[PDB]
């Protein structure tokens, strides 16, 4: 019953309770050296009193070499307001650029 959001929900605003966990699932292929990071370049929440985050990678069930898996970000809003979760698919030693893929979801808590 946790909200499960995927790349299709880029730009969505989800109404959520403070303390409620939201699961974001994004395609991700570690064999490229790219992964999803907060727009700033790390896996950590920009501010934990606003929302906390945990992350885990799941490889593809096919176990096929070179095949993409899925990263799961478990986000829990901790304060009322509308929180932008802004992620960017990057190689962490290069950082973002014009052609980097981005994902955003807004989490609105009362």
When divided into structural domains, the chain yields a total of: 1
Resolution in Å, one decimal place: 1.7
* Pairwise CA distance, residues 22 & 100, whole Å: 24
DSSP run (H or E) holding 81 = strand 81-90
- Does residue 36 contact residue 89 with C-beta atoms inside 8 Å? yes
Give Cβ neighbours of residue 47 (< 8 Å, ≥ 6 apart).
none
Residue with tokens 């981005």: 102
Backbone angles phi, psi at 31, to 5 degrees: -70, -10
Take residue 6 and report the two structure tokens written for it: 């995927």
Domain that holds residue 98: 1-110
CA 103, 9, 5, 61 torsion-angle sign: negative
* Beta strands at 3-6 and 21-28: parallel, antiparallel or unpaired: parallel
3-state SS assignment for residue 31: helix
CATH of the domain at 49: 2.60.40.2020
- Does residue 58 contact residue 72 with C-beta atoms inside 8 Å? yes
């Amino acid at each position: 019953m946790s909200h499960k959001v995927t790349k299709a929900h880029n730009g969505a605003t989800l109404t959520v309770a403070v303390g409620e966990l939201v699961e974001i699932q994004l395609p991700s292929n570690p064999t490229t050296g790219f992964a999803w990071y907060f727009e700033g370049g790390t896996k950590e929440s920009p501010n934990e009193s606003m929302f906390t985050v945990e992350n885990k990678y799941f490889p593809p069930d096919s176990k096929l070499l070179g095949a993409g898996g899925t990263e799961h970000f478990h986000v829990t809003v901790k304060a009322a307001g509308t929180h932008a979760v802004n992620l960017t698919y990057m190689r962490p030693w290069t950082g973002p650029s014009h052609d980097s893929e981005r994902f955003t979801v807004y989490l609105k808590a009362n």
